[PDB]
Structures are given as C-alpha cells and as structure tokens.
Amino acid sequence: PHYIPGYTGHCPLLRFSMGQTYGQMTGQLPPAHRTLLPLSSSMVPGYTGFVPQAQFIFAKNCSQVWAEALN
Amino acid sequence: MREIVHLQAGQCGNQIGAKFWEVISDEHGIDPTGTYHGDSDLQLERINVYYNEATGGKYVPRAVLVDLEPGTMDSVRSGPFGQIFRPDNFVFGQSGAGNNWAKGHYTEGAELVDSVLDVVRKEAESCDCLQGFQLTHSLGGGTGSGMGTLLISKIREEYPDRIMNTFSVVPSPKVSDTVVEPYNATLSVHQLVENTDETYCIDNEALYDICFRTLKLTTPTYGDLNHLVSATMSGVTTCLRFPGQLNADLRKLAVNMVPFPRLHFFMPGFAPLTSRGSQQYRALTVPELTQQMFDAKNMMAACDPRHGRYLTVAAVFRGRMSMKEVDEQMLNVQNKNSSYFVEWIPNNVKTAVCDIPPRGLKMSATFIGNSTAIQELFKRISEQFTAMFRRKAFLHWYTGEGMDEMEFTEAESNMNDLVSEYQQYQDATAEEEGEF
Amino acid sequence: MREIVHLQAGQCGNQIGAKFWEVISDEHGIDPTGTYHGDSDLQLERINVYYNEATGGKYVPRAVLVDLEPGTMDSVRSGPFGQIFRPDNFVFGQSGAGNNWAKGHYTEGAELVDSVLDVVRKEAESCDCLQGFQLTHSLGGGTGSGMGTLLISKIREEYPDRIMNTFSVVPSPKVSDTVVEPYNATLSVHQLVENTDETYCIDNEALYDICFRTLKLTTPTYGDLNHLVSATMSGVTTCLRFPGQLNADLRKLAVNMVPFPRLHFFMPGFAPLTSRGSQQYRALTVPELTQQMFDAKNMMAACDPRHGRYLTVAAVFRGRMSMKEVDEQMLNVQNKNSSYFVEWIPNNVKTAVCDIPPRGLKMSATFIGNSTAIQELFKRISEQFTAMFRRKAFLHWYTGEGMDEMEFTEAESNMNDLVSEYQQYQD
Amino acid sequence: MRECISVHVGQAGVQIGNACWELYCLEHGIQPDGQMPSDKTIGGGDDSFNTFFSETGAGKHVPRAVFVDLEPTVIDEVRTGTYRQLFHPEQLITGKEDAANNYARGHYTIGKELIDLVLDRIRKLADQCTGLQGFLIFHSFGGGTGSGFTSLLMERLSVDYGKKSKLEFSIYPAPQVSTAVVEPYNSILTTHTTLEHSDCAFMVDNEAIYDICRRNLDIERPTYTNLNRLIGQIVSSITASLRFDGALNVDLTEFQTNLVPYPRIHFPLATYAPVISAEKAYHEQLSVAEITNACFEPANQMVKCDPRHGKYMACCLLYRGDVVPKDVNAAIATIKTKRTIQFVDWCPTGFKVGINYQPPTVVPGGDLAKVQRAVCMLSNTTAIAEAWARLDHKFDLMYAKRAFVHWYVGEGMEEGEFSEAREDMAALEKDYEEVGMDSV
Amino acid sequence: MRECISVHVGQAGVQIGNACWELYCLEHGIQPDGQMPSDKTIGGGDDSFNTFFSETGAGKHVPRAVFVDLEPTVIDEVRTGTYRQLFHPEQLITGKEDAANNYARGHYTIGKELIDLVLDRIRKLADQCTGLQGFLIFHSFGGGTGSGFTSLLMERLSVDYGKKSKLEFSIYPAPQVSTAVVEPYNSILTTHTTLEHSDCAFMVDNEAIYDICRRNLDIERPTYTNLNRLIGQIVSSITASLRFDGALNVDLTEFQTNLVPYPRIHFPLATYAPVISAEKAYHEQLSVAEITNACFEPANQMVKCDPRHGKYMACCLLYRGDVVPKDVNAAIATIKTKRTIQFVDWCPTGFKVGINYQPPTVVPGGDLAKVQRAVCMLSNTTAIAEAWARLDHKFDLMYAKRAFVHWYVGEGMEEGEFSEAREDMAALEKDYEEVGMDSV
Amino acid sequence: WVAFDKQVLSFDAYLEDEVPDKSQENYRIRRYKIYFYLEDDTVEVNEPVLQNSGLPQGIFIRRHRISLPPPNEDQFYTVHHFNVNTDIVFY
C-alpha cells in the first residue's frame, strides 16, 4: 500500500525525509480513504409511469436504476 | 407525461383549490408533510400529473396560487394540508380591489402579472409534456374581470394554444346586496368565451340545495361546498391518473363534448351523494348512479336541465360497471321528450370507466353537460345588468376611474349573442325547414 | 501540483479574502490551529495549490494580507481562522489610506511596494511551477483601488507569463459608501483592463438582491455576502484541487472564454442557492441547476444579461453527475435562447465537472459568464464620473499628490473604448 | 415456417390482444414468463408456435406482436401485469398524448410522430421472418388512434410490403349503444382507407356480443373482458389451420380467394356458434349439425344485422375438434334445403370448409366451456348494407350542421375529406346493391 | 509476437484507455494488480497475452501502454487507482501544467520539454518488441494535449519508425454541441497533422454514443465511464484477430490494404452492432443475419452522421463468437440487394469479413450483456463529408472575426497556419467528393 | 363559552426535521406555540419570528379542531390530552 514512484502531488512529511525510496518513505508515514482504492423483475423497461428516486442515476441500466432505487 | 398545473385566483380559487389538493393528496396517498404513505402502487404510478418529486421523498404539488390580498393565502398555507405548496408559487400583491369595477380596471394594471408568469413558466417547462392547465376562480368581488381583463390580457396572449380548464363560480340568483353591484355583471364578459371554452360553471345556490335536500347536512359551510367541487375536479381527471377500461382524458372529453368553439358551459355533478343516516340503506348500483347524476337536483349550476336540450353529455364513471343504463336515459327521455337530447347529434353521451373508485365509496360518476338551458344562467346576469346600468347614480365612485363605456356596452353584446347561439341549437332540428 | 499564490488588499478585500480562507479550510478539513482533522485523502491530495507545509503536521495558507491601516489586520487575526495566517505575511503601513487613489498608489503605496513584492517573490520561489495569482479588492475605496492596482502592475512586470486573476468589487449605483467612488474605480480599471488577462466583475446591490429575494434573509450582514462571493471564489479553482472527467484550470478558462486581448470581465454565480424553507422542495439535480445558470436571478453583478448578449460562458460543476444531462441541456438552453448569445461563435458554453461536491451539498456549480451587458455598467459610471469631473468637484484631494488634469481624461479615453469595443461586437 | 405478425392498435386493440395472447400462450405450453415449463408438456411440439411466436437460443418463446398505441396507461397495464416478460419492452411502444377520439390527430398530428418507429419495428420483426403469410390488425372504428393511426398504418404498409394478405379486425359503432359522439366521423373516415388497403376486414359489433353473452353464456352485466375472450376465440379459429393439422387445412390466402368476390366486399360477418356456459354445456350433446344451424341463427351473429334482409354470397366454416367431413356435408345440405336462408345464384357452391383436429382451449376465469367440437362462421351477405346506411344517417345528421368539424379541420385536414369519406360510403351501398339483384 | 504499442495521449485518451485496459485484463486472466492466476481456465491461446502484455517471471504482466498528458490530476487517479501495480511506474508519465485547449501550446510550448522523454520510452518498448504491427494511439480531436501533443507525437514517431501501420482513434466534435468554444480551432489544425502521417484514423462522436445508449441500451443520462467502456470493446474487437485464432484471421495489415482506397481517404467510421441490454439479450434471438443488418442502420453509427446520404466505399466486418461463414455470406448478400444501401460503382466486392472464435468478455458493473456473438464493422463511406463541412463552416464562422486568435498566435504559432489548415480542409473535402460521382 | 371567554392554554413546542441539502445544518429544531382554547376545544399553533434567517412564518395550523392520531379518529382533542414533556401529533 505504497505510493508508486511516478506519483507527483502531495504526501505529508515528505520534505523532512531523506535517504529512502519514494515507495518506502511514503509507506512508512483519515478513515474515509479512497485515493489508493484499497423490483426490477416486476417491471419492464418500457414503463413510463412513476417510481420515486428513479430520475437521478447512471452507471447501470434503466432496469437497474429501478433496482438501486428500490434496494 | 400528461400533466396539469393548477392556477388559483381570489379567495375562491385558494379556498376551493386547498380543498382540492387535500382530496388529491388523500386519493394519491400523501400526508400533510408531503411523503407517500399509500396502501397501493397505482396511487403512485401516475402521480406526475399533480405532484413533483423533490429530494427527500417529499412530493410537492404543481399549483401556483394567485391573489391580490396577502391575508387570504396565509390561511391556505396554514391549513390542514397547507404546507405542501412550495413558497415561490405563493405570489401575493399588497392591495386588491373593492366596491367599483371601474376601480378594478383602473387599479393594478401590470404589477403582479409578470411575477406569476415567471412561476407559471418554470413550473410548466421543467417537465415532460403538458396536458394543460386548470384555473379555479369566481366571477365576483370588487373587481369582477377588472383585475381580470387587466392581468389576464397579458397572459391570454398565447395561452389558448393547449388545454385550459376553468372551474368558475358563477354569481347566484338571490338578492342584490353589493349596493352598486349591477355594473360588475355587465363589465365581466369580454373574452368570457374564447379563452377557456371548457368552463365548469358552478353556482353556490345549487351547491347549498345539494347540501340541504340531497346530502341533508344541517349546517353546510363554505368548506363542504368546496368538497363537492373537488370530487368533480378529481372526476374529470381520474382516467388520466388512474387506469381504466375506457380511458378519457381532458382532450377526449373536450373533443367529445364541444361541437362548436364557443361552449364554455359544463354543469357538474357527482352521482353517489347520500346522507349519513341513509348511506347504510343504499343499493349503490349502476342504475342508481345514473338516476341521480342526470337528475335536476344533483346539478351544481342553477339551471334546470328540463328548460333546454342536452347538446352533449359526458359520463365519466369510476369503478367496475356498465354504461348501457345511460342508453335508456336517452331512449326514454330523448325519444319521448326530444327537447332534452339534441336530435341532430345521434348519440349525446360519452362514457368512461375508471377502475379505481373514490375513497370509501365503491362506485361513482362525474357528469358534465352542455345543456342549452344555460341560456338562463347568462340571462339572470342579463336582467342584472340592464336593471341598474341605465341610471348610473352611485357610479360616481366608478366615474372617478371610469374607463371607456363602450367596453361597458360591448361585453353584454358578447354575452347575449352567446345566449342566441344556445337558443339556436336548442331550437335547431335535423330537417331544417320546420322552424321558420 | 500546480499552485496559486493568494493576495488580498483593502478593507473589504481583506474580509472577502478571509472568508475565502474559511471556505477552503473546512472544504479541506483543516482546523483553526492548522491541523488536519477531516476525513478524505482527496482533501490533502492537492493541498499545495493554496497551502504550505509546516513542521509538526501543520498546514499554513499561502496568502499575503495587505492594507494601509493596522485596523483591519488585527480584526482578521482576531477572527475564527485568523490564527492560520503567517504573521510575517502581515505587511501593512502606518498611516490611514484616506479613501484616495493617489494616497494608496503614489505617496503611501511607495513605502510598501518594497515590502509586498519581496514577500510575494518569497512565496513565488518556494513553489514548484507557478501558475497564477489571486487578488481580492474593490473599486470604491482608496487602498483597494490604488495599491490593489499597483500590486497588479508590479507583478506583471515581473511575472508576465503567469495567468493573473483578481476578483474585484465594482461600485454600486444606489448603495453608495464613499463620495469619491467613481474616481477610484475609473482610475483603477484603466490599468486593470491592460495587465490582468482575467478578472471577475462583482457588484454589491446584486449581492444584496440575491441575499434578499433568493436566499430570503431579512437583514443580511456583510459576512453572508462574503460567504456567497467565497462560494464562487473557490469553484473556479476546484478543477485543480479534485479530479474529474474533464477538468479546467485557470489558464483553460482564460484561453477558452476571453475572445480578444481586452474583454476579460466576467459575471460570477453559484447554483444551489435556496432558503431554509424551500430546501425540502427542491429536487437538487442539474435540470434545475442549468436554468439557475443563465437566469438573471443568480447574477452577482447588477447588470442584467437580457440587455446584452453572452459572448462565452463557463459552468464549473461539482458532484457525482451525469454527462449528457449537462451536455444536452446546455445545448438546449442555447437553442431555446438564440438571441441572447452572439453569432460568430457556434457553441457559447464551457462545461467543466469536478468530482468532489462541497460539504453538505450533494450537487453544486458556479456560474462564469462573459456578456456584452458589462457595457451598461461602465457607461453608467462614466456618466457618473463626468457629472463631477467637469465641475472639478473633488480633485483638490487628488491633485495634491502630483496628479495633473490630463491623467484623468486619459483614463476615460482608455475606458470609453471598453463600452465602444463591447458595442462594436454586440451587433 | 408459415406465420403472421399480429398488430394491436388502440386501447381496443391492446385490450383485445391481452385476452388474445392469453389464449395463445395457453393454447400452447407457453407460460406468462415466456418459457415453456420443463416439467409437464401441453402436447407435441410440431413447431406450431412459429405462426405467432419466435424461438430464441435460451429456450424462450416471444410473440410476434407490436402493441402500438398513443395511450400510455393501457400498455403499462401489460408492462406491470402477468404477461410482463413475454413481450419485449420495445415491442410495446407508447405515445405522449392521445388523439382524443380524433381521426385527424391520430393520422396527421400525433401519428407522424410515431409512424417511423412502428414501421422500423414491423420491419425488424418481419426481417427474421421467412414465409410471412400476412398481418392481423386489431382496432375499433371509434377511437382516434384506432381509426386515424390505423389508417396511416395501412397507407404505409401497402407500399412497404406490396400485395400481401393483410387481415383486419375491427369494432363497429353499434346502432344504439355507443360510447362517443364523434364515433360516426371516425368510422366513416377509416373505412375510406380500409376499403382500399385491407385485404379482409372482419366486422364485429359490441351490442351483439353483449346480446350473446346474456343469452347464450347466461351472464348478467357483461364487461369488456368477456367480449375480449369471444373475439380471441374466433381469431384463434381463423389461424387454427396454420398451426394444427386437419382434414381440410385452409390457409389465410384460401380465405380471401373464397370469401370476398370483388375488391370492395371484404367485410365478412363473424359468428361463433358453440358459445355456451359450463352449467348447460355438458348436459346436451353438441352435434356438428346443430352448431352449423346456430351459425345461421339471426341472434348469434356478432354484428347487429340479420341476414334475412340480405343474401349470402360465400360462407367460410371453420370446424375444430372431433369433426369428420361427412356430417359437415350433411349439415351443409340441410342448410341449402331452406328457402329462408337466401343464397345468391352466382355462387351455386357457396361454402368453404375447413376442418381442424384441435378443440378450443378454455381459459381459467373465463365463461365459456370445454367443448369437444366447435365452429366459426365467416358469412358474406348484402345485409351489411343496412349496418352502413344507419352510419350514414348518423354521419349526415351531424355533419350537415358542421358539428365537431373544427376539431378535425384545425388538426391538419380539409373539410372536403368528410364529403370524400361519405362519398365512398355513398358508393358502397350501391356496390352492395348491384351484386344483389337477380340476373335476368 | 503479434504485438502493438498503445500510447494514450490526452486527458480523454487516458480515460478511454482506463476502461480499455480493464477490458484487456479481464479478457485474459490478468488481475487488476498484474498477477496472472495459476490453474484458472481462460479462453486464449498461449501467446495471446503477448499482443498487449509483457511477461515477467513472478506472473506479473505489464500493459504495453504509455499514458501521456500535461495535467497531473488525471493520471494521479490512475497512479493511485486499482491499476497501480498493473502499469510499470515509468509508463505513467505526466506533465507539469495543462495544455489548456491550445494547439499552439501542446505543440510548441510544453510539448518540446516532454516529447524528448516520450519517444525515448517508445524506443524502450519497441526494442523489446519483435514482430510489431502498428501503433494504437488514443486521443481526443479538439483538445490541447489531445490535439497539440498528438501532432508532435505522430510526426516524430512517423519519421523515427518509418513505414509502420500507425492507426488512430479520435473523438470527433461533429454535432451541434461541444464542450468548448475554441475546440473547432483545434479540430482542423490537427487534421493536417493526421492527414499524411496517420494510416487508419477512426472517428467516434459523443452524441452518437449518447443516442445509441439511450435507445439500444435503454439507459438515460450517461456519463463518460460507459462511453469509455463501449470504445474499449470496439478496439478489443479490432485487435481480437491478433490475439485469438479464428475461421478468418485478419491481421492489422489486412485492414490497411482495403479500408484505404486512396491515401487521403483514411478516415473510416466504426459501428458495434450487439449493443444490447442485460434484459433484452434474454429476449431477442441473436443471430448473424439480423445484427449484420442492424449494423448498417443509421441510428447505430458511432459518428453522428447520415450514412443514407453518402455512398459506401469499403466495409470490413469482424465477427466474434459462434459465427459460421455461410451465415455471414447470407448476411452480406441480403445487404447488397438492399437498395437503400448504396456503394460506389467502381468496387463491386465491397466487403471484407473476419470471424474470430472468442466471444467478447463482459465486465462486471457494465451495461452490455453476455452475448455469444458480436459484430464490429468499420465503414469507409462518403457520408463523413457532412460531419466535416459543418465543422469547416463552424471554424470559418469564427475565423472571419479573428476571435480566439491572439491566444494561439501569442506563443510558438504564427497566424498563417490557420488559412493553410483551412484550405487543406477544403482540399480534403473536395478530393473526398471527387471520388463520389459515377464514372463513365 | 362565557366562563372561558378569553382563557387560552399556551405551550412551548418544537419539531425535529431532516434536511436534504446540509449546507448550513444537519438537523432542525423549529420552535412553536401550542395554543388550546377552552371555549371551543380548539387548537392553534404559531411560529415566533426569529432573526435574519426567515421561513414563511406566522400561523402554522389555523384555529380548528384537530381530531387525533389515526387510531380511533372519531373523537377529538380535549383538555386532558395536553401535558408538558409529552408527545402530541398535529397532522
């Protein structure tokens, strides 16, 4: 779970450290940490009525956006 | 996709409309906060006809509320189902009208108009496909159509391009107790015809008679009078909202009830009205609904249907039902009294069957009729302009403002010809030779 | 890895800049004592754009606090986040500004330019690859218009290749604070049209109007106005600070909004503005945010866009968002309003999308628009200038420091070309 | 290999097909979720579903149907109903606004906004087809999309597919019971297109199915569902020989060459004789003679016109069940001995006979009964002229005062098209007269 | 052995390649970290990974890609993403500050400081290469670093590596909407740079992906991730015949000799036919004849254009999965007989076909479905002159008033190259139309 | 109605709320004034005017007789159902 050598940007307390590789001086040094990255069958997609919370979301089918809205 | 925006004007639009929105919220299953607590899914399938989804599971209506007095729609926003309306829709003036119609058209010409047009615009455009608008108001007050033909002449510029219903409260025939009253009856008309042409004229005197003789409520307020109209408003839109065996939206009613383009007269009526002590002893059958909705008693407009001819009849019913009983209503009453169903129209009845009934009731209907006995409604207003128009005595209050009095005198000329056009199609028969 | 050094001048610009450092801090989760306590590593990913590391897990903002009187530096320091500023960056004079342009640019500005340039060039060499500047000031006061213009002149003479930005409070027609208000403005924008290359034009009655009938606050103080201008202050630079599906830095907005080397005055804005009573009644999605872009309801400058035509517009979005739902709708608002956008420009709009939304908001955006309606503002204050200059009303204060008669009319000949250039390309 | 695409247009057409595809799936082994069940088999395979269903690689049967309609919440009943996964979501296509009982709106204003998509789906459904016999449409003469959009569909299908056996099923406005006031306008306008672009137009009335439900089926207060099952029973019998083998297998092409004698006369009378309730079905024997007799009875017709005022031209009898040819010939012979049943002298033969071995299938919750044998009658009389002369009386009664005409002229048609639609109707009565008088 | 180098320059190209390389890893057995799981069954050959991946001892496979940009904010999410250990750390090179929608900056200002380190790395990859076919770059067509750095990259890689089949993937700004106002300036400036150095520059639109996903996938409001996913499949289909054996193997050199009839007409359009949802693939039968026909429909093209106007010149079709050659020969023959699809009169052959034995891999969380058959067709037609003429007028309408010119001429670039790129665009259009009329 | 002519029982109250867009708050506490009227058994609630943050303020529910929670809704609110530090449901 280290930083790759090509990585520019900001890592804390890099300026006061020395003598170690970029994957070791970063790996030695927040709870929500995501940078490193560690019913649908009861309705057909031609439907044109209304379901709540169903006019918002992508990354999945219409027949799947009524899955995530219900579930 | 098909959708309605409710415009409420006056106290009358605001008090009737507030009762209307609580009815629809019960029918669709919305609490006074704005969330859904219904016991079915079809109560939610077409709720994009009157309500918009706001983030948080909070359904919000699509009514813009218009009045020229701040005080009236604070009671609307603090009523039982009153916090559902979004505040921006609540568009108020600071000074309204009073006493003189001539004041009413020489008072606030264009101040509140453009503010409402912005609200009507955003609410209509942020949607899919507009079925139309509906407007609740009464023909009265210290302005009549004085604010009206002032404010709405800026809105009628493009509004008659789609559907626009109007449940209008017509003046009652009782007494003249507004002192200088018979000047607001003449200056009311102008464009009283050619901008809605789907007006459901609703009298308050007939509203009491259904509450006194039919419902047998001892003390009917204005509130339960607004309950009767709210059922009818729900009735003419229930095929659009709830599924049915024979669907009929607003246009399908409008196409199938309006032979000529100058017929803003649809006297309403709700079939299964029974007293509380007599509801237990009620059959509630298809003939039972039909003998009440066609009856002169159950007519929310002070015009007895046996004074003229039904030009066209609509029969939007609700439940699991029949329609052939209505056929016997012509064949008995028409072919025997041909003056109660217009003969140059072969079949005068449109029917509709919406499966989901009103709450509590098993079966219902919603009659609207274009009977030619509505000649008398714009005739009581006709003897109520001529009676005091010629003296112009207390009109010195009018005189200070006092617009062009050709506009005084051209309004009834655009009303008595409407009566004549109804007198024609009451007396016109199939073989056009025997009435000359 | 790119960075923006911050500067602020004047009394209002100090408080606007201070409120900007409130907004950056809690969006990047850093407390009044400069220690990180938020919960996201996105927050410290691009922290070097505005802040500097200090020993002990400590983050200090990179800003230079500038004025003439010591009555504003102690007020900012006494504030809730006044401690995070470096005291060595507190560069200021001794005597008062005097609400005069020639006092803050010629006489008392000359003893501080040797101090403010060294502290800026100290912060411009400790960095990796410099990109641009930020300045908060106004055109109504003395020190905000005099040294807030002299600072612009000296920096470009030293850093010509870095895209300068300055966010100015242009004067108000009716809400008037000083009687020499059009004097200080027309002199300042005489240089700001030449040596800025990007600046945003912010009124104060529009801030009053959007805080009264949009946000629905009864008695708005200054602080909520500072928070509202700081909301659009940070949204320009959010593409530097968090990733996205197409990003746009300050140089990207400069090349791709400014059509000609002189017309770089823009209208700010911020999309999810709503009262506390209407928050439950808003379906917070981009079909209502895109209409919130182009309507005059959310204009932070009080020149209505319907009396002009949009040259170029940028809309920088922040949140988990669909892409055609922005892309098709920004086309549709151009198609539905064809007369409000200029010809000789096919698409008038930039879309930029940032991944991370602000705290507590699922979805936000900031409006940035170039309109020909800016000429309404500059011609009006030109008329207000010549109402007093032909009388030689208040020049006795300005002429005492070494300003002759022709330095004023040269500024107006170099200002009336702005309304001339805007009208020339409006039709 | 032999097959036909079914088109369902209008609220009438969609609701007919829902009780019709319910019959078709149950006639075969097809469940509401498309797939046939692994356990239990309804019969031999024979690839008999091919006439109405298409087989996929995963083992799913898909109906060759398009549910095209401008009314959104009658198709969404199918979209949330039991037959959910049977149909494609893109086979079921909806408009945004109704035609509102306007022929002009369904033909000109709304109809052009959806005619491109439905022809693309008809083309894609027919592209995998090999030996397509023809099309079946289901509509009513009174609706907007049932008359206007139907008329536009035959206009486009005539040039895209040429001369092809394009059958038509429709619902007539009854003489008395009618749910619309503009209904004589829509019926007289859509027949102006049916007369030239429909190869055969089956003629069905609401009042007559109301009459046979209360009299034969012995049910009081019948609903639209019961009329829907009676129609789907006949349409199954029309396409009966396409799927099941019989003594006399009769094709859709053999229908047209043996029913309609001249290119305007394609309006057969529909009759289903063994329609009987379960409590009175198993008591008496149902011979093939007495159900051939019940086909010629005046009240068992499904259009309100008795053939005593007319003369028969060609009768197509479609028998199903345990029916041998020899006693059909005895039943036909004893009909010919009656002088009350009038036959034209230019059809000495008169009858076309089709025998099938598959008896009709009963639906759960239906009101019919399981009969060993059954018959469908396709008559052709001059008595249909009085069913249209009443419609002209209904049309002329309200067109003469120009009632409801501005509800048509404003929506993209001229006033002369009304007189042009009555024109072909003014000729159709005289066309039925000239094939009725005896040659001397 | 059958290898290619895929340098992905631009902020769009690195995000196209993010979903392109996730498809490549899951098509083989390579995990997101680069590990190659033992005793796991996958469907390649044994040297199938060798097109896009190198072999190390520890089982780690590294992609043969170089991610190039000038914004450090879009590779840092790759450099910290799930695919950190996949890419070798020196592959993911970055810039210092944005190119900022400027052809004059990515070609003259920042590119010179970093093009020296780009081609040196391509030398490090090509030295390890032994049988190289071509170069697969991914870039946008109207950006700063996708249109300015791309020109320096291609011009230098063309002169260093000589004659090598350097094909190109680009995202074309055709339609009514765009993400920038200065973007039409970048469009024609990079067209001159890709006119003589490119060999097969495939154009892909953005609104075209929007319409085919909204319709065929039944999915509303797209983001860029599923746009990346579809491009990943349409490049994986192209290079599948290098990675897997098939009935008709088509190498990348076989594309060159017949997709490009003249050396200036090397802009083929692409199309992927089974873009089908997870629910519909369970409903429709998927066969060769009806998706080859559905591939030529104008509503499924990857470029927002009208192929019914221009007449086709060359089409190659690539088939994946259970495809047999006679079904294609029936599918091609039934398309040559369609009169709505028009070819140029000179070439009667028209088509090339390749059949691969590997069905496409569907990624978890995607929108496509597990189909046993796929068609990817690369069409060279006369139609893209429409997409080019309304971009040339889109440029000219800006260039007349000299808008957004001082930003370009202020650094590196002189004004005279604007008119030279415009007249070469006119010469490109004119030469593209002079191969349209019928010879005599 | 003559022994209780102008006698009103007044209570403090507040409502908890969930906010969709948490730009300035996480949970809301809106103060209220429960008025009970002895002459007609009638309930009125009010929202007092606060600082520069305004809602639509004023009357929240009009002076009418709110029945009960949906269990046994036929009855109405009396003086015995009102107490301090308790939970009462108004629509």
Ligand SMILES: Nc1nc2c(ncn2[C@@H]2O[C@H](COP(=O)(O)OP(=O)(O)OP(=O)(O)O)[C@@H](O)[C@H]2O)c(=O)[nH]1
């Ligand atoms: N037999 C039968 N007839 C029906 C049924 N439903 C509707 N109809 C017929 O349809 C007529 C009503 O008009 P429709 O054709 O349904 O109108 P529509 O199809 O909804 O078309 P639009 O008016 O454009 O919306 C009635 O006169 C009935 O005869 C049904 O379920 N069974």
Ligand SMILES: Nc1nc2c(ncn2[C@@H]2O[C@H](COP(=O)(O)OP(=O)(O)OP(=O)(O)O)[C@@H](O)[C@H]2O)c(=O)[nH]1
């Ligand atoms: N499919 C897809 N397209 C993208 C994505 N990101 C950017 N694009 C495309 O890139 C276009 C804008 O990017 P460009 O301005 O060309 O960016 P560029 O080519 O990398 O050059 P720069 O502007 O300097 O970053 C948009 O119209 C998108 O079509 C992505 O993640 N997926």
Ligand SMILES: Nc1nc2c(ncn2[C@@H]2O[C@H](COP(=O)(O)OP(=O)(O)O)[C@@H](O)[C@H]2O)c(=O)[nH]1
């Ligand atoms: N049904 C009903 N009628 C009302 C109400 N308020 C007023 N009206 C009727 O409207 C007439 C006067 O109302 P009006 O002055 O027009 O109210 P305005 O529109 O606000 O000016 C009276 O004769 C009443 O009968 C109400 O709340 N309900």
Ligand SMILES: Nc1nc2c(ncn2[C@@H]2O[C@H](COP(=O)(O)OP(=O)(O)O)[C@@H](O)[C@H]2O)c(=O)[nH]1
């Ligand atoms: N947003 C914001 N604007 C302010 C604040 N204080 C003052 N202003 C604006 O700035 C103007 C006064 O600043 P100015 O006189 O130019 O300050 P000076 O340059 O130091 O003299 C007023 O018109 C205000 O509209 C503040 O705290 N926040």
Ligand SMILES: [Mg+2]
């Ligand atoms: Mg319908």
Ligand SMILES: [Mg+2]
């Ligand atoms: Mg980029």
